[PDB]
Amino acid sequence: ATKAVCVLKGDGPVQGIINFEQKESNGPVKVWGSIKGLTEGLHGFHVHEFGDNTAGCTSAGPHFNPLSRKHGGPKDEERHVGDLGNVTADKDGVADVSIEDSVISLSGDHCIIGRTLVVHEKADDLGKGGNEESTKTGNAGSRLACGVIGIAQ
Amino acid sequence: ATKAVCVLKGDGPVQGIINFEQKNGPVKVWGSIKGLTEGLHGFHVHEFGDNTAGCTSAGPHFNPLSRKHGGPKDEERHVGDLGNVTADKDGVADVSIEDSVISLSGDHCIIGRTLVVHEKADDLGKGGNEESTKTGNAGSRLACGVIGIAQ
Ligand SMILES: [Cu+2]
Ligand SMILES: [Cu+2]
Ligand SMILES: [Zn+2]
Ligand SMILES: [Zn+2]
């Protein structure tokens, strides 16, 4: 349970720290922190399956999908576990993240620890895109920066 | 929780990939490291998977049982204590280990933590001072990475 952290690094400008708290044990995770260098607007934000950075952000694999369902937004029953939808960058390209999710977890099974968190090139269409890609990645595009979700204090 | 891997990266020349296999049995830790200075190099697990301020924020060695620093085979050691990997003349350490004092799924879960490789030799604790009681006089943290689930 409780406290995690993930330094997001890439090959371009975007970088940021994302902290995770989980007070109880089987419940909701507050995700918060700050990411820079982004273009203004919406950006896909998910946990991928593998905390594998060998071949960069590519090695993280697909979205963390322990239930093997289809891609969706954070509020849809048919979602991926990694599916945290979007974060939002102001101008200055800064995205003060503040999310609360009750599917992802720091404890077990849905435990996203040692997994990869990705912020994307474009908006996540939350499964509503109307193509096959929209059901896999929500059309979020490249992976701008990523990091392995590790234990904190 | 059977396979893991870590990209040891550092703000210098030292860098390499390390793998982990498990099948509550032992763990095989293998891979290579390069850019090292020839000799023995301290190598092991710290407590926090926190790269926020670099290797520093990884904190003290992973020690679930509040004990003195040690070599992998001392009874008294930090669960994370791997002792040394040997960098051949070409700064290339061929790493292979089968520590059963660490695991990928336990209360000693090494997953989500930071693997670290050091300036100098892990004193394995017989260094004759306070410092070798904590770190084994292994010195500065030349590279690190978070241990994460591999495909
Ligand atoms: Cu993603
Ligand atoms: Cu160390
Ligand atoms: Zn998804
Ligand atoms: Zn130690």
Side-chain angles (χ1 to χ4, degrees), chain A residues 1-2 4-22 25-35 37-153, chain B residues 1-27 29-33 35-67 69-97 99-109 111-151:
Chain A
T2 160
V5 80
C6 173
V7 180
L8 276 76
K9 193 57 180 175
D11 308 328
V14 336
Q15 27 154 325
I17 297 74
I18 305 290
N19 321 271
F20 301 67
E21 190 138 84
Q22 189 188 26
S25 58
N26 62 327
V29 168
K30 292 197 154 169
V31 179
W32 89 90
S34 159
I35 301 163
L38 295 155
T39 51
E40 213 200 333
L42 290 173
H43 289 262
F45 195 74
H46 328 97
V47 185
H48 284 234
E49 199 177 358
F50 315 118
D52 196 329
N53 190 243
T54 49
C57 290
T58 296
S59 306
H63 301 173
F64 188 39
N65 195 14
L67 301 181
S68 26
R69 287 173 181 173
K70 287 217 158 297
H71 176 81
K75 298 280 153 277
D76 307 317
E77 177 164 9
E78 191 69 26
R79 50 169 280 182
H80 287 154
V81 156
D83 282 344
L84 308 170
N86 294 288
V87 302
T88 288
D90 61 21
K91 212 46 280 186
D92 300 45
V94 179
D96 177 34
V97 176
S98 182
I99 290 173
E100 226 220 38
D101 199 55
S102 68
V103 176
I104 69 150
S105 181
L106 305 190
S107 190
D109 243 34
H110 292 9
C111 174
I112 48 92
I113 215 93
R115 243 106 201 185
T116 302
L117 165 68
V118 196
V119 53
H120 285 265
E121 169 200 352
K122 304 179 310 195
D124 183 334
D125 69 32
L126 310 179
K128 310 205 292 281
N131 53 24
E132 176 65 3
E133 196 59 56
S134 193
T135 53
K136 297 172 220 138
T137 63
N139 291 292
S142 317
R143 319 194 170 173
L144 300 197
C146 58
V148 190
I149 313 175
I151 301 212
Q153 305 298 131
Chain B
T2 257
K3 301 188 199 147
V5 55
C6 171
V7 171
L8 293 184
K9 240 172 173 53
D11 32 35
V14 180
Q15 73 190 256
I17 301 71
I18 304 292
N19 298 288
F20 308 74
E21 282 206 272
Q22 185 183 233
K23 209 180 186 178
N24 37 273
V27 157
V29 182
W30 83 87
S32 81
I33 311 190
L36 292 177
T37 301
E38 193 188 339
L40 293 170
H41 286 265
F43 166 91
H44 55 69
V45 194
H46 288 223
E47 197 164 350
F48 309 122
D50 184 349
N51 172 257
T52 27
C55 290
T56 309
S57 8
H61 299 188
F62 176 43
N63 174 218
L65 288 15
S66 306
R67 285 147 167 252
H69 171 83
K73 311 256 57 183
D74 293 323
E75 173 68 55
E76 260 271 313
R77 108 226 222 299
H78 303 154
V79 171
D81 301 341
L82 293 191
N84 277 273
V85 306
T86 321
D88 67 20
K89 200 193 312 87
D90 271 329
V92 168
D94 179 320
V95 176
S96 180
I97 293 169
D99 200 58
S100 249
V101 195
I102 53 89
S103 43
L104 310 183
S105 137
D107 286 292
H108 297 357
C109 178
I111 308 243
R113 261 102 188 184
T114 299
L115 184 46
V116 175
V117 285
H118 283 269
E119 196 171 327
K120 300 178 293 180
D122 190 313
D123 234 334
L124 312 176
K126 322 299 181 173
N129 66 23
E130 172 67 350
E131 184 65 31
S132 292
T133 282
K134 342 193 197 94
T135 71
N137 287 330
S140 95
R141 317 174 159 195
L142 299 180
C144 50
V146 180
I147 290 154
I149 312 169
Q151 157 155 70

